[PDB]
């Protein structure tokens, strides 16, 4: 009695019948699709009788608009109704509705009471529904078939409507000095002097010194700048620059926010040399990483930052780049910097790349995010901020909490 019967409209419903037939055969169920199992020669109607009455377990009739009026399928369905009455088994016939051009109000009376399994526009999810029904009614290899079984169900896995919160990479700039000052060091500042060597962030723009610091801060390394008139320096409020409302023939808007961006970058560079962290020269920017043994058990706030890998040492490091397009933010970038024993940097960069890839083989979202947050918190001076010395009286304030995002669609994390 262990056999599945699939009646169908022969002239114009073959393809689905074959697909379902070989799919069910691959699933272990015994099928009797006529175009695939009807022996040549044999009395076909008598053989169909024998199959339906003697060994058919379930009857699958296709509800295509070409069917439900075909004589052959109607006769097999009438015999199926008789066997349903004899067996007294609920839902012995399991209709399948593949055609979308017929409605449920046009189905023939013999199967109108029974609920058609949905195959209208998705044969694989329809087959998953059909197999769910078969499991429900206990319809009648141990490694290969389970893969196909799981593939049928997993082909339509989607995003569950759940809310998820995300820690991003950008760190907002909570507060900043209100005024950007261009000092007039026409002759006090040496023309061949390097502005990047200044103890405080500044740039030589248009024979002015653009900086967030006071005019008298550049004294120890620039003694001749002393006794400078404050009226000569031209001051522009930072809020106007950030909002984009400030635009003058003196400085253009885009140049002004580019200048404050590079000022923030220079402030970061000159700050972390104080924050007890060594630097590594990447191709485009500097990455700041802490040496081994400088942290208690090499962890900060239950997150490790330097560890042992294959006789050598890895250190989690970050690189900063401020940008102001959506809002004043500092984009961070995560890296692994590699050392012989945590004290000596690796000169060869091919070994550095290989070791970075090896350490990133098994690191994932939780590890990356926790290490970035721990590093940012370790750089922090107070509880929720990082200080950058852009002025003896003015500081750049970098938030400790990155820009949190949220989403209405997400997934269930596999265990």
């Amino acid at each position: 009695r262990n056999k599945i019967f699939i009646s169908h409209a022969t002239p114009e419903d073959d393809d689905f019948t074959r697909w379902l037939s070989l799919k069910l055969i691959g699933l272990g169920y015994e099928v009797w699709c006529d175009i695939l199992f009807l022996d040549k020669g044999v009395d076909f109607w008598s053989t169909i009788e024998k199959e339906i009455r003697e060994n058919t377990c379930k009857f699958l009739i296709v509800s295509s608009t070409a069917g439900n009026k075909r004589e052959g399928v109607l006769k097999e369905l009438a015999v199926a109704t008789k066997v349903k009455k004899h067996l007294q088994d609920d839902m012995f016939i399991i209709p399948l509705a593949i055609d979308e051009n017929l409605s449920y109000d046009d189905i023939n009376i013999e199967i109108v009471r029974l609920n058609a399994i949905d195959f209208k526009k998705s044969w694989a999810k329809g087959l998953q529904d059909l197999l769910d029904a078969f499991e429900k009614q206990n319809v009648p290899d141990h490694s290969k078939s389970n893969l196909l079984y799981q593939q049928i169900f997993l082909h339509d896995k989607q995003a569950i409507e759940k809310e998820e919160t995300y820690d991003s990479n950008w760190f907002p700039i909570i507060s900043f000095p209100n005024e950007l000052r261009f000092h007039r060091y026409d002759w006090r500042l040496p023309k061949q002097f390097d502005v990047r060597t200044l103890a405080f962030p500044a740039i030589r723009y248009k024979e002015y010194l653009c900086t967030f610091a006071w005019e008298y801060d550049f004294i120890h390394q620039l003694p001749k700048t002393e006794t400078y008139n404050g009226q000569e320096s031209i001051r522009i409020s930072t809020s106007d620059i950030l909002s984009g409302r400030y635009d003058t023939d003196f400085i253009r808007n885009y140049e002004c926010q580019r200048l404050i961006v590079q000022l923030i970058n220079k402030a970061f560079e000159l700050r972390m040399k104080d924050k007890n962290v060594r630097e590594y020269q990447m191709s485009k920017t500097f990455a700041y990483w802490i040496e081994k043994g400088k942290l208690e058990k090499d962890k900060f706030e239950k997150i490790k930052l330097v560890g042992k890998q294959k006789n050598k040492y890895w250190h989690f490091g970050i690189s900063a780049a401020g940008k102001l397009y959506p809002s004043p933010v500092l984009m961070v970038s995560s890296h692994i910097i590699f050392t012989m024993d945590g004290i000596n940097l690796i000169k060869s960069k091919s070994i550095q790349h290989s070791s970075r890839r090896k350490q990133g083989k098994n690191w994932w979202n939780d590890k990356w995010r926790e290490k970035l947050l721990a590093f940012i918190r370790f750089l922090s001076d107070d509880q929720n901020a990082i200080y950058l010395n852009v002025g003896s009286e003015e500081k750049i304030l970098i938030s400790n909490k990155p820009l949190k995002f949220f989403g209405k669609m997400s997934y269930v994390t596999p265990s």
Partner: protein, 131 residues
């Protein structure tokens, strides 16, 4: 908190008009859109290259498993998924026995003479390069 909007993943057609997301599942379930009758492979390489290609083609014809089948689907075998013959016994083999230019020219002349002179029809030339 900024709202991360969701873009639903589009579905790609397959055989019989069905739609799926992953090619590795849509092909295994339904198969490709149009039917070709088979692939007459042409191989331009060394004898060891031809043997390696033949062995891997025979391996392809039978299903091959990934180490973790859930994340990356299985391969049910070429004939199972595409319904097309790509057997290793129908190979048109052209044995080969500024250095970049000459190395290119070798395979180039082999393929050009094959496609021009020889009569056997080849649909895709599998240049099995050495290492």
């Amino acid at each position: 908190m900024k709202e991360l909007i969701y873009i639903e993943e589009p579905s790609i057609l397959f055989a019989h008009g069905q739609k799926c997301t992953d090619p590795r599942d849509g092909l295994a379930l339904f198969g490709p859109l149009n039917q070709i009758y088979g692939i007459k492979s042409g191989v331009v390489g060394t004898q060891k290259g031809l043997q390696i290609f033949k062995s891997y083609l025979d391996k392809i014809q039978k299903p091959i498993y990934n180490h973790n089948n859930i994340t990356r689907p299985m391969f049910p075998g070429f004939e199972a998924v595409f319904g097309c013959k790509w057997e290793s016994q129908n190979i048109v083999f052209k044995e080969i026995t500024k250095r970049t230019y000459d190395l290119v020219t070798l395979f180039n002349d082999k393929i050009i003479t094959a496609n021009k002179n020889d009569e056997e029809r080849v649909d895709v030339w599998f240049v099995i390069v050495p290492e």
